[PDB]
Structure formats: structure tokens, C-alpha cells
């Protein structure tokens, strides 16, 4: 029907469970600090002389550069909790359904 | 020898050797 | 379905599609924006819209503290 | 380091030839 | 002039000092900033405004 | 012109780290390398 | 919304391509890193807890290339950094929904920076400073990627996307590298906060999980109307780079898929230099997670051809009836029906197999295609072979590139980056003073000629 | 009608139109293509199409060769 | 060859900066896409014209 | 069963809190001010810590530094996952597992009723009763697992923890906790090798 | 450049055609050996890169 | 080694630094610290983290 | 209207600071801002706003 | 005794610590190497025979 | 009417937003870092957070 | 007294002026021949702005 | 005197010429 008045035909109802969603911080905490935006950019300077040494360009993204660097050193299969390193790894079978 | 005195002694002589001044790696 | 190579070469002849995406928010012609952070105030009404009348500085949510 | 002998197939834009004695 | 009128290094033009501490009493509001003038630059106080 | 002055200064071509560093540092960095390595801060060119 | 949109189970049920390992074509371009089985995420979410409210405590590192490995001599420095509270950005859902509409990381209470000092004897620590402060030797770091990246747009259903570069000096240029990004999932990085980023899922731009990488067809590298950059008749089709050659008569596909021959040769040569001396599976250490060979996946299937079977009858989904009487009609619900012989999956085996036509494609992801700027495509060093040749020539050429991408019904982005050198030369001459001088050779970004 | 200068400039003004037509088959947008040489079933639907499953290695209609 | 859309005039073009050491002039006309093969490839199955 | 004493199957080293070392009641050995905590070693700072935790668990920022420093020397040039050959199956990083859950807090929740196991009923009518026996019951709505998601999101408090098996806590007798040699530098000084010192 | 044309109703395409000085010099130094050196001067088909 | 590898004086190994000034915008957080690398000691920037 | 957000910039009007041209260094800078509605903003009718 | 004693199934059911990586604190300090899924032991047990 | 082109009466000047300069292909002219958003000249901050 | 909750809108409206972006380091007009109109980065070489 | 070191990649200012690893030793052994 179209009612929730506990009618007779309301006995026959089915309910699928809601779809799973899991939400937590990104790998290596990418996106939590503004890197590479010239507007809100960081400053590491020689406090006595405010000469910033972190001149950052608008294009070269250091988030993508760091992920590649992490893979080059060692391998990204052991989950390091402290830095929150956990590579997003789709299940190999689900992408390519080998139906046997 | 003052700088060479900061290295572990594997026996009698220090452990200096195999100059590994690196840092060239990039994408390539 | 036509007007730009509707029967021959197209997709993009026109251009040196060389505008690099300009990097500044707001380059999305009719994408209902989301919202002000946190708030889900739906409106972020679309940037091809009513932006001459500059940001409506709405009264901030401080019901408990301000009262 | 065998030999760099340079007397003066061939090409028209250079009157140069090289002998390599190994 | 082309030589010593102005610099070439990445020098910010306008700064946005934020209050280190603040208070909001019943009758007044007090804010405290620590404006820092780096070496080899000089600030004209006329160009300052809350 | 395989070497431009701006390239040699920024270590895109020219001497590697084992050479342009002062002899005091190279001897130092070789010594204290089981702990507190200094070999990932001075880059050295690899031209083709 | 994306819950309560029931999918007919018969769409992809137990008989789809009953023999082959075929990627379901409708979800070929769907982002695969958004899944309950994404083991990288489900571990990264259960780390915080299993409840709605989480008083977290994290240890975000520093990942800028000139600061990541600096060795600070004993001064006294400021260290300021703007963080980001945009829930759509810092968080990451699994459906890729819009988290700004639901709940946000309300508060950053007490961020404070930690530092660890090696306890070094004051005799050596003073000697080390005394020479590290000398201008003869000073730290020098190069960004690992070292590439000036730009995003060119691609509208809906567009196929040919051309780009251009005005006349410019290609002093030390190490090649190109490109991929495709769906524009509905990419932040406007230049803005402090963009309210038009309705997304939470994986962001391949700044994360590294590229999946749309397999939809390119052809590439041409024109240097101011000269022949293509490899144009010394150096390929099977020396005028441009075929990638995903379609139905073709001559023998130019490779590796049981539709990837062409030279492109496989170029890709294999670039990563591993294993092109000329025969093809072999490369060293386990030499291929990384983001390498070409580890992710390459050919696949193929055969389907009932329609133009030769003489009895083909295209039955739409709502009407096909396999396994009827023991499952739901078009929703995952109570089973309804009668039993009866099925009709949907046309048999491809036995004495009654129908004639069929094979279709073969490949599924490469998590990598970005590479075209090294080297004379023989090898990697014989950092400063490539032709980089030094430009310097000796000392002339400027404009670049013109065009692409042929598979059409998509949603706007996307062509993310192409030029390999460059991105070195810095940080030098600290006195106490509490840092002087960092940046150079980025082939695409400079400086207003000062020293 | 509308689009680029529905009322004004440019049948094409947007561009630099300098895409020099790049020469490769399939540059055309929605042309019902020809047949594989002497294989008329109107095979080439378009180069905006089911070419997502590219690689239709199709066995020809040679039945006597099959016997 | 530069494309020209349907029902469109005012076709602009350009050549990026380069040298004109022995340039001798231009020569141009106006073909039709229906009547021009893409002979940069081995065989174009989208050319239906005798 | 297995005897952890003589075959290396330790599993209880996750229940230590603080180790204090004193040489004949002098100043503590760990050093002058080598540790964030003033005069002891702190582990499992679980009850509450204003700013000292690591890896989203209840360890200590200095104990993690010491442990990684004794095994892989990864303490001063930043932390990173150690190399495979240097990380065995009895080493710290291989067996370190942090975890945390979200039990429903009772102090701040409006209406919380702690129901014991014999009275709580979930999935009733389709399962056994307190024993893996024949199913008995009627179906009815359930009541035990308090929800933590959705519109009804009863407030909760988070408790974290960590497990560390097959590993022995290590406190190297060195000035900087490194492994510069088998014969430590501190256990070579005249102060320790030419006199007798107590230990508490 | 900028060509203004009549608005034809079907997708035509312009056919600009510059003027260059492409020549060859075929050389046969000895038996069975032939080599050439092409040169298109304004729009050179080769440069430092290729 | 024993002679001149590590100090015998009093030194911390880990230092925390509270923000000198903080700015909490609706979607930002701008924290500014002051690193204080005292005399006769060197800090490797890879160890620092927020 | 009645309820109205404002974003104003107030100058400096003290003779020793109004134009000071202060050399490099680091100075603390605090000021107490009136919050009394009656004094801050004037009313045309001359009535009492508090 | 350790076999004739029954355990309530609901003590740890399918709904315990849902979505959490918890270690079931009641069974945390019990010996973990005593289990049918102890691949090392069940290999040695089956090595002798059955 | 009144043509603003040759007669200097311009009136639609207030409809502009961010304008960007990028000189060679990457270098942005407005300066090394010379504005509060040192990548383009912003003229109308449509919605301002600070 | 019976007002309604509201929201403000700002905007500016200027006519008759052409926006200007001087090609100087500090944007000041210290002369006709500007400051960057004679230095060799923008005099010796050749760039192509976008 | 034409050495072949000019064909070797340069790691710094010296060529990357290898050692005497020129071998083809293996068999099932």
C-alpha cells in the first residue's frame, strides 16, 4: 500500500539492509594540510628575519608526489597506523569478475 | 682521525666505508 | 545533438582546448553547489547565478550562547 | 683507446673519415 | 629607477596579524597582536588598521 | 654546452656529492652512518 | 538517495559471461576504490572506531619536498601551516556521497607540533654545524615527482581533445605523463574552499588511484608543425602513438588484448628498459605498486553475434527469464514465479553452440602512461639524452598535442604533467636564517634571473 | 539557433580552431561509418559508440571454407 | 587542414611563433569533409564516397 | 598447552604500565631528561593522556620512540615502516596492532538500562537460549545491541587498546637507545665497569 | 590568420597550404649505396628534438 | 663508539610546541609555532610532525 | 534593516603612532575597543539607545 | 570438565562490536596459541598420524 | 545610444571576478608573492570567509 | 518592533573607469618607462602571456 | 686513443663503467 497505519496488508513487507558505507581519514592524511595553494601556504621562516623559505607553486601537487615516493621506498602493503598509511586496494576479483 | 673516531669499531678498525652520498632518485 | 560537428568532425574542433582549467573555485556552469562547510545549506546556488549581490552574510548560529 | 686516426658510406656534407685500428 | 627601488624576493605586500589573546567583557573588547617586522624591511605605521 | 652555470650550481649536472662537499663533511658522513645518516640530503647528478 | 534504488539482480547474476574473466562493461568506468571490500579503507575506518562520534587523535606528517628532509642548524624559526576542516576533503566515504550534507569534523582543539632531537655531543654537534653552515656544501632536495602538472578540460561526449604550448625553451625536459580524471571528483585546489565539490570518495588527482587510464586511443606530439617528436620513422605508425587500437586487420595488437605493439614496447622500455633484449617479466623489486606491468590485465569474451546467427532475438532485461520461479522478478525480494526453461544466456558450448564474435580489451589502472623524452625511450640517466641536446642547440620550439579519448557522458579532465627538474638549494649562513633558492628548469616559475 | 553567438559573433569565435584536423580514421563525430572492405552490414556504427568493448575480432562469413 | 563547423563563418587559425626563412606565400581552398579521406591511416571506414 | 617461557609465545606484554629504573636510589638511569615523562618509563597511558599517545592507541609517544629505536634504529630521522629483512616475526612492528571501539557511555546517556546476558534478547525465536541447542522463542523486536549509527545515535565513549604478541619489551642500556654496537657505550664507561651499583 | 567564408549548411573544412622549398640531394658514393638529405626550410620536418 | 658520539649533559629527546597564535575559520585552522633549536644541537626536519 | 552584520576598518589616530615608520623587530600591539552601544554609534533623533 | 561445560552462544554473537576491530577484552589475556586454527600445531599433530 | 567604445563612458565594469596572468607558460606575473591571494587579482569576493 | 529575520547583501557599482594593472614591481607609477620595462628578463628574452 | 667510456652514463663526473661481471656461467648444475 501507501500507508503506515498497520493495515492488514502491512504484514507482507520486506526489508533489505542498508548499504554499507565506511568513513575515515584519507591515506597518509592527504588533504588535511593545504599544500600547494598559494593562498594558504605554509611558512617556515628564520623568525629573526621573516624570510619565508617555503615558496610553493600553484601546480606541482605534493600529495601525489608523496604517494609515489612512499611506494618507491619499501612497499605499501604493511599498514602503518601512526602515519595512517593504508593504500586503497580494490579487491582484484570484484573488478574483473572471473565467473567459474 | 677526530671525525673517524665517531664510527663503531668492528674489531680494531672503524666501520667507515662505502660512500653512499645519494638522493638522485625521481620518477623516471 | 548537432551544431558542433553534428554530422562530421567534432566533439572538439574548436579549440586549442587550452584553457588550462583555471584553478579557482566556481568553474562549473550548472553544478548545484553543496554547501557552506558543515552546514549543508543547500544553497551554493550555482555560480552562473546571483552573484552580483555579494555573499548574503547570514546571521550566525549562536542561539544558545548569544541569547 | 686504440687509435683515433682521422684521414681526409661517405656523405657529401663532410670531407672527413675516421680510421679505427683495433 | 631600475636597480634599488624595489626588491625581487618573495616579499608579502600586506599581512594579516591575528590576535594572540582576546577577551570580551561586558563593556569592552581587548585584543592583543604581536606584529613582527622582519629584517631588511620597514613598516610605516600609517598603513595599519584593525 | 653540456653544463650551464645554473645547472652545476643546483646540481642538475656536474660533480656528485662525494666530490663537491668539503673533505671534512665526506669523512664525517662516512663515519656517522650506522646512526644519523646524512646521505639523503645532498643530491648528486646522473646525466645521460 | 543512493539507497532505496533497487537493482534488478538478474543484471549481473550468476550467468554473466559464464566462462570468462570479463570486466562488466557498464561498470568499467565506475571508480573501483569505493567498495566495502576496499581493504585499505575498511582498515582505515575501523581505526577510529565503529560509532558516529569519535574523539580522534592523529599525527599528520610533513610532506613538502624542501622541508621533508631538511636538517635544521641551531637557530630559532617560525613554523606556520593552514589546516583544512572541509569534511568532503579530509574524510573519505565508501559510496562517494556528499558528506557536507550529513556530518562534519566540527573541531580541531589542540594541534601542537612535536620534534625529536638526536642527543649529540656538543663537540661534534658544533663541528657539524660549523661546516654544514659553510656555503660550499648545503642541502639540496628534488621533488620526487618533479613535474609541472596542468589540467585540461574535456566536455561531455568529446573525443578529440587538443592542447597547445606557446613557444618555449625545452632545456631539461624528461618527458610527459598523462591520465584522465572525472571532473565531478576533483577539488579546485587553488581555492581555500570550494562549495562545488560534492564528493567524498577516492580523489585520484592528489591520491594516486587512477582508473580511467584505459580510455585513450591515440596521441600526437607535434613540435611547431614539425613531424611528431619520435618522427624519425621510429615506430610501427611513426606519426603518432596508437594505444588502444580498435578493430584492425593487420597484426598490430599484442599480448592477447587490443593494446598495440609499439605502445607496449614504449611502456615496457620506459619503466624497465626491457624492450630491445627480449620481453620478460621484470624483477619483483623493479615493478612497484604504481608500475605498468603489475596492473596490466587483458581479458576477452565471446558473444552471440547478431548479424550472422539468423535467429538472434534481442530480448530486453525485463523480459528474459532465467532461473524463474526461484528468485525475484526485478528486485531482491520474495521469490515469485513458476519454473520454466530459461532463455537469456545464449549457449556458447556444446553441439548447439551459436556462432559468436570475440571482443578483447584490457584493464590497466593505478598507473599513468609515460612517454620518456629520450632518443631510444630508455632511461640512461636523470638528465635525458635529448635534454642536453636542446641546451647545445639553444633554441625554442612550440608544442602541439592532440588526444583521442573514448567518449564519456560526463565531463572529465585530461591530467597531463610534464616531467621537469624541481631542485632546491637551501642554505643557512648564520644563526636562525634560511635562504632557499628554487629552480625548475624546463618550465620556470621565477621572475628573477638571479 | 543559440550556442555560440545565437545572436552574435562567431559561427565560431570560441576558438583558435586550430586543431589541425588530426589525421586518423574516426575523427568524424556521428558518421554512420562504412563497412570493413567488402563486409557490408553497416558495421562501423560511429566513432562514438560500443567501441568501449574495442577489439571485435570478427570471424568472417566464409562457410564453404568452413566445410 | 582546419575544420569548419556547419553553418559557421569566421574561421580563425594561427601558427605558434617560429621562423619564416624561405616562406613563399599561401594557397588555400575549401574542401568538404564528406569528400576527403583521412589518408593518414591505412584505411578509414568512415569515408563513404566514390 | 604452549609454554611461553621457553618457546617464545609471549602474549601478556600488553598489560604493563610504567617501568622505573633507579641505580642505588640515585637519579633514574634513563637519563637526565631523556623522556617526555620526567623520571620513569611510561607505557599504556590508557586512563587519560592530555597529549601523549601514538598510532591511535594508548601507548606513549616516548615508549614508541624507544621501542622502534632499539629494534630498527628508526627514531630520529623520522618514522617509517622498516625493511622486510630487518623486520622478523618476533619484532615489534610486525606484531603491533592498535584497536578501539565505541561502547555506549552510561553517565551522559539519558536513559541507559544495563541488561545482563540472561535477560537481553536479540534474534530471538530463530536461535537457542543460552546454549547451542534447538531454536526456541518467538520473534519480537530486539533490545540488547545499543545502536551507534543512523538517526538514533545514542552517545558513546571510546576506549582504545593494543595487542603485542611474540615480542619482549626491550630497554637497551645505551645513551641514545641505539644499536651502535653489541658492546654498548654506556656499559663500557668507567662509572659502570669500575664500581658497584645497586638497582631498583 | 582569419578567413571569413560563406555559411554552408554541411561540415566542410578549410585547406590552407603554405609554400616551402623542400628539396633533396641524392648521393651514391659507391656501388649499392644511396643516401639522401631532405630539407624543407620554412616548415622544417626535423629539428633538435627529433 | 664511546668518545664523542652522544652527550652526557641534560637534554630532552622529544619536545612538544604549543601554538603561539591560532586562527579557527569556519573551514580553516592556522597554527603558528616557533621552533627553538637551541645551541649545540641539530634537528632533522623529518622527525617533526603535527 | 534592523539586524545587520558589519565589516569595518578602523584607523589609528594617536599622534605617536599615527605615522611612526618603525624599523625591524618584534612588537606587541594591543588595544581596548569600546563596546558601549550608546557611545559607539550615533542616532539622529538624539534618543537613548542603551 | 573443559568439554562438558556449555557456553551461551549470545555471549559473543554476530552483533558484538559490529564494525569494530575489537579484540574481545574478556578473551584478551587468554592464551592465543591454543586453538584448532593453530596452523603450526595442527601440522605437528597430523604429522604423527590420526 | 551612447557607445562606450570610442566615447569613454564605460558602465559594466563591475562585473568582473578573478583575473589571472601567467606569463611564459607557468610563471604567474602578479608577483612572487605580492597579494593576499598571490595567484590572481580578485575583484569581487562573492562569498567571504575572512 | 515586529521585524523579520533578514540577511544583508553588499555590492559596489563604479562607472567610467577602466580597471588597471600597472606593470611595475610595487604597482606605483614612478615613471613612464616602467620598472620591469627595462630589466633583461622582460627585455632580452621573449615570452607569451596567457 | 679513443676509449669507449664516452658511451657510459655519468654518475657525477666519472663514467658508470661496471666491474668484471661479464659472464654466462649457468647450467642446471
Author numbering:
A (entry chain J): 302 to 401
B (entry chain 9): 4 to 31
C (entry chain P), H (entry chain Q): 1 to 67
D (entry chain V): 142 to 149, 158 to 171
E (entry chain E), L (entry chain J): 52 to 101
F (entry chain L): 4 to 51
G (entry chain J): 503 to 952
I (entry chain H): 653 to 702
Show the paper's wording.
Human adenovirus D26 (HAdV-D26, or Ad26 for short) causes acute conjunctivitis and a prolonged enteric infection among humans. Significantly, Ad26 is being used as a vaccine vector against the diseases such as SARS-CoV-2 and AIDS. In addition to differences in the hypervariable regions (HVRs), Ad26 displays a short-shafted fiber comprising eight β-spiral repeats, compared with long-shafted fibers found in archetypal HAdV-C5. The overall structure and capsid protein organization of the HAdV-D26 capsid is very similar to that of HAdV-C5.
Here, we report the improved capsid structure for one of these vectors, human adenovirus D26 (HAdV-D26), at 3.4 Å resolution, by reprocessing the previous cryo-electron microscopy dataset and obtaining a refined model. Using this higher resolution map, we obtained a refined model for Ad26 capsid by performing real-space refinement using Phenix and model building in Coot, providing new insights into the structures and organization of minor proteins, IIIa, VI, and VIII, which were not previously considered. Not surprisingly, the significant structural differences between the hexons from Ad26 and Ad5 occur in the HVR loops. It is noteworthy that all HVRs, including HVR1, are ordered in the Ad26 hexon. Moreover, the FNT-peptide adopts “elbow” shaped conformation that appears to hook the helix at the base of the disordered RGD containing loop, which perhaps is critical for fiber latching onto PB. The Ad26 structure provided the first report of a well-ordered full-length protein-IX (IX) that revealed the connection (linker region) between the triskelion and coiled-coil forming regions in HAdVs. It appears that the APD domain in Ad26-IIIa is rotated by ~120°, compared with its counterpart in the Ad5-ts1 structure, which results in a longer distance (by ~25 Å) between the visible ends of MDLD and APD domains. It is noteworthy that this reorganization of the APD domain in the Ad26 structure results in the loss of interactions with the contacting hexon subunits. Notably, except for the ordered short segment of the processed peptide (140–149), the rest of the VIII structure is very similar in Ad26 and Ad5 virions. In the refined Ad26 structure, the directionality of the polypeptide chains of pVIn in the previous structure was reversed in agreement with the recent Ad5-wt and ts1 virion structures. Furthermore, we identified two, two, three, and two copies of pVIn bound in the hexons 1–4, respectively.
